[PDB]
Design a protein around this nucleic acid. Structure first.
Ligand SMILES: [Zn+2]
Ligand SMILES: [Zn+2]
Lengths: 62, 814, 115
RNA sequence: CUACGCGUG
RNA sequence: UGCAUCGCGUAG
């Protein structure tokens, strides 16, 4: 199902961002952590997809 | 209509509602409302609050207004009544004086003083010699004590001339001895309390005297400045060099304590390094506006922010589950457990939750009877002091705490110190107080909540000495089967069924009950932690003297209750509560749970009308309970035993640190003879200062179904070899999450993963007997994945993918 | 044994280093003033610490507490020496403002010296 | 039984 | 990178 794969993609995305030294910058890490935690707790797939797109944008920018 | 009354006579006794210028409400009404709090029926409390201008009616329109955690502003509202309570107390004293001068002997009851403080009762008053009148004030002050702390009645004593309008008193920062102030407060407020009060608990006769004096000290310490409390230090000259060393400790509960072996080796080096004196002295001043707790100093040039990393994902297992049909759309079993990452402000924020620990005064007579009853639950066990050679340490590669973590692990210090050195340290702790520092560490764990978890790593010395002190009793409790406390009782090999059969023992109309302690560790009062420590130390009657036991209690309070906490290189003062890394974490929590349960039962019995109870035995039991609470100082062993038997018969309990299951008589509970969930809610309100939501508590009418939840595991009745058994099955989401998400990457795949999946399959096997088919397919999925892992790695391994190995683990053979 | 000696040496070195970090001009004052010679530990850093570190969560707390180059805390006057951010970068006094606060990595750690 | 590793409050 | 409890796996 799409929701579980969205959650797992968010997990791996935040792992990659962590290994990208994003935690060195405080506010970027705060935004990514909030987005990921909300994705994991999201009960509606569309909002989870929006937050996942935001996190992927965070990764793509760098 | 119904009004609260405190009554005592041959026919009936207790503090309950009865159908029976002056204000409309009395003081008994306020005490009843604040000690018997039910959200559904608060009309009396609402009316008292609006009539005396603590809040407006609009305040009540807000929901969760009563809850302290969700709405802390209620603490302010209640505080607006404190002054009134205080000015009632001060009036009571005057009345007593008059009676003493008039040679009148009578009992003072709460239901006879209006909320303006005026006493309108002139009955039961019998004239005697003038100047020889003696009032009975045990029940009044005892029942009113819990309200004094919640309403913050003595706040006026923190101001010049005891007037809130005038400025605060400016006490000298270097002052720490407030013995005279405590004596003055006691003589001004509790003048006719005939029991001797000791400001310093070093001069207490017995543990009960310690509890009484500490109950009064909890109230008196709120007035005094917040910097007086803590390690008392002094400059000394050692080897011709100046060292600032701790020579005492000021306790909000135990007063001033001075070390007996103060003077001016590995043992002395450890006592020096563990002491926060040196670190705080060499640390820069710190002001932290991220917290409401007191800040001591900063031992680092820069502040530290620690983060929680994201959990790793096991792609192979998740793809295997998807291919085998799990995690579909609309399926009942779904992933609800993950590793939740946290920002740099997480750790400190968790510490800020200690804001929910409030100064709490207890009903001292109730607490004394309750500790006497609770001691019965720990009679079977044996306790005492042991030597270093008899101490068992499970893992020696753990952290030694601060500053000991800098140089090595606990193995280093356990190897460096010989057994004689450890015994010398223990004897030193029996004569002197060693303050210590506990580090706060964020935990890497799976959960279904975004909130982070913090644990307290205490220093090596505290663990060593508390082990030498308590390990014998702690192992005795862990080796006993069939008791109320079920630590050490496994759930495998029929343990679950045996425990559940033990709890159901001989209840006439059995119903089942369970509850949760909201913010147990953070919100636990300090008085109850001291009581738990005293109950755990009562096993030292022969090996320890009164002074030794008091100094051990002081060490425990200065290393757990009110320690110093390093959070990111900065020292802070813990307001109270219970640490999570102390030796007696689980067992002290069990003592606290049993105490809350016995308190709920006592409140339930006394809150009953008494006249309505159509049973003579329970009516006499209620009468004698009131007698042994508010009329008899000396412990009555026979009635304590009778009440213990009554509770064991009509209130069987199963206790792990914070989880508790109860089998109770439904008819007695309906008639008020035994506690219900509402009684536990009221007790947690007036004692633990937390609101218990009925959603997190469960009640089971049918014994066949079993406990709804205990230790996070559910119960299923399944047929094994013609015999039905209770088996613990876990939430499938937890097991699937543990299988999919791992903390580190070394364990994500390889030969080691087989052990993790074998253990998860051992845990999941009971799901095969659930009526739901997906719950059962979880175990077969795990088995198939174990088999595939063996195949990829490539006779004995067969047992891992054949289900007989897992079926054996839940049969009563072993 | 050998590791025992290493631990003893390390603890002694740490204690004597903290002594080097310790000053007695302020300490002996309170020690002699005290009739007993015993003082609460908490008051020692308050009345003897040369440097003050203030952690600020947001701008409102900054304005309420220590807005200017000099402020008053613990009945003492302190002069700001540095204002680092959560990323340990040297934020300047001018940058702190209600307008630029969203572009500052709160919390802000201000280090000041006793006047 | 000892050592090491893994998996409830 | 805490205190316990229980259950497994490999070696002596
Ligand atoms: Zn006493
Ligand atoms: Zn002993």
């Amino acid at each position: 199902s799409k929701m579980s794969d969205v959650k797992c993609t968010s997990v791996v995305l935040l792992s990659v961002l962590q290994q990208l030294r994003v935690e060195s910058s405080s506010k970027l890490w705060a935004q990514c952590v909030q987005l990921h935690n909300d994705i994991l707790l999201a009960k509606d797939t569309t909002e989870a997809f929006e937050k996942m797109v935001s996190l992927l944008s965070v990764l793509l920018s760098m | 209509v119904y009004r609260a009354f405190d009554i005592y006579n041959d026919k009936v006794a207790g503090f309950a509602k009865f159908l029976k210028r002056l204000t409309k409400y009395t003081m008994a009404d306020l005490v009843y409302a604040l000690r018997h709090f039910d959200e559904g029926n608060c009309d009396t409390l609402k009316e008292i609050l609006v009539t005396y201008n603590c809040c407006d009616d609009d305040y009540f329109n807000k929901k969760d207004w009563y809850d302290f955690v969700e709405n802390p502003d209620i603490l302010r509202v209640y505080a607006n009544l404190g002054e009134r309570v205080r000015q009632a107390l001060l009036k009571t004293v005057q009345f007593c004086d008059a009676m003493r001068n008039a040679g009148i002997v009578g009992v003072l009851t709460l239901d006879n003083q209006d909320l303006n403080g005026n006493w309108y009762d002139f009955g039961d008053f019998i004239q005697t010699t003038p100047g020889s009148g003696v009032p009975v004030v045990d029940s009044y002050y005892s029942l009113l004590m819990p309200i004094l702390t919640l309403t913050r009645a003595l706040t006026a004593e923190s101001h010049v001339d005891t007037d809130l309008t005038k400025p605060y008193i400016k006490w000298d920062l270097l002052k720490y001895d407030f013995t005279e102030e405590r004596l003055k407060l006691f003589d001004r407020y509790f003048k006719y309390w005939d029991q001797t009060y000791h400001p310093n608990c070093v001069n207490c006769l017995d543990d009960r005297c310690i509890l009484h004096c500490a109950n009064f000290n909890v109230l008196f310490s709120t007035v005094f400045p917040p910097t007086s409390f803590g390690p008392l230090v002094r400059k000394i000259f050692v080897d011709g060099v100046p060292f600032v060393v701790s020579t005492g400790y000021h306790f909000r509960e135990l007063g001033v304590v001075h070390n007996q072996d103060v003077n001016l080796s590995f043992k002395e080096l450890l006592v020096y390094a563990a002491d926060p004196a040196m670190h705080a002295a060499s640390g820069n001043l710190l002001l932290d506006k991220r917290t409401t707790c007191f800040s001591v100093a900063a031992l680092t040039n820069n502040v530290a922010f620690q983060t929680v990393k994201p959990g790793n994902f096991n792609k192979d297992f998740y793809d295997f589950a998807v291919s085998k049909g799990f995690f579909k759309e609309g399926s009942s079993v779904e992933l609800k457990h993950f590793f939740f990452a946290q920002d740099g402000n997480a750790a400190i924020s968790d510490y800020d939750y200690y804001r929910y620990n409030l100064p709490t005064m207890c009903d001292i007579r109730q607490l004394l009877f309750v500790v006497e009853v609770v001691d019965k639950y720990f009679d079977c066990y044996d306790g005492g002091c042991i030597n270093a050679n008899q101490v068992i340490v499970n893992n020696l590669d753990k952290s030694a705490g601060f500053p000991f973590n800098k140089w090595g692990k606990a193995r280093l210090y356990y190897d460096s110190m010989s057994y004689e050195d450890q015994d010398a340290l223990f004897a030193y702790t029996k004569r002197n107080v060693i303050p210590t520092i506990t580090q706060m560490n964020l935990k890497y764990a799976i959960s279904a909540k975004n909130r982070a978890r913090t644990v307290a790593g205490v220093s090596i010395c505290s663990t060593m000495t508390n082990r030498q002190f308590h390990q014998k009793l702690l192992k005795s409790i862990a080796a006993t089967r069939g008791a109320t406390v079920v630590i050490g009782t496994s759930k495998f090999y029929g343990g679950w069924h045996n425990m559940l059969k033990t709890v159901y023992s001989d209840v006439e109309n059995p119903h089942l009950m369970g509850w949760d302690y909201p913010k147990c560790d953070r919100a636990m009062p300090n008085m109850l932690r001291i009581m738990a420590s005293l109950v755990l130390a009562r096993k030292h009657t022969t090996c320890c003297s009164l002074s030794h036991r008091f100094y051990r209690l002081a060490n425990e309070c200065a290393q757990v209750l009110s320690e110093m906490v390093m959070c990111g290189g900065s020292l802070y003062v813990k307001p109270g509560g219970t640490s999570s890394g102390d030796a007696t974490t689980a067992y002290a929590n069990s003592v606290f749970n049993i105490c809350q349960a016995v308190t709920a039962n006592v409140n339930a019995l006394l809150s009953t009308d008494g006249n309505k109870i159509a049973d003579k035995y329970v009516r006499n039991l209620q009468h004698r309970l009131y007698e042994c609470l508010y009329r008899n100082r000396d412990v009555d062993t026979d009635f304590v035993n009778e009440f213990y038997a009554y509770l064991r018969k009509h209130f069987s309990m199963m206790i792990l640190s914070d989880d508790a299951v109860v089998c109770f008589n439904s008819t007695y509970a309906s008639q008020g003879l035994v506690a219900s969930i509402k009684n536990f809610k009221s007790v947690l309100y007036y004692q633990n200062n937390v609101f218990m939501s009925e959603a997190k508590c469960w009640t089971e009418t049918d014994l066949t179904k079993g406990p709804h939840e205990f230790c996070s595991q559910h119960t299923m009745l399944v047929k094994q070899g013609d015999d039905y058994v209770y088996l613990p099955y876990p939430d499938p989401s937890r097991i699937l999450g543990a299988g999919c998400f791992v903390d580190d990457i070394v364990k994500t795949d390889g030969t080691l993963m087989i052990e993790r999946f074998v253990s998860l399959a051992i845990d999941a096997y009971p799901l095969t007997k659930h009526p739901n088919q997906e719950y059962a397919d979880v175990f077969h999925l795990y088995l198939q994945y174990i088999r595939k892992l063996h195949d990829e790695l490539t006779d004995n391994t067969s047992r891992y993918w054949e289900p007989e190995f897992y079926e054996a683990m839940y049969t009563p053979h072993t | 044994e050998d590791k025992r000696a290493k631990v003893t040496s390390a603890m002694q070195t740490m204690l004597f280093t903290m002594l080097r970090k310790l000053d007695n001009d302020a300490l002996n004052n309170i020690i002699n003033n005290a009739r007993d010679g015993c003082v609460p530990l908490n008051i020692i850093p308050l009345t003897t610490a040369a440097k003050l570190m203030v952690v600020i969560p947001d701008y409102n707390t900054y304005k309420n507490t220590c807005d200017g180059t000099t402020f008053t805390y613990a009945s003492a006057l302190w002069e700001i020496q540095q204002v680092v951010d959560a990323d340990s970068k040297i934020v300047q006094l001018s940058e702190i403002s209600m307008d630029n606060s969203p572009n500052l990595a709160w919390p802000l750690i201000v280090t000041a010296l006793r006047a």
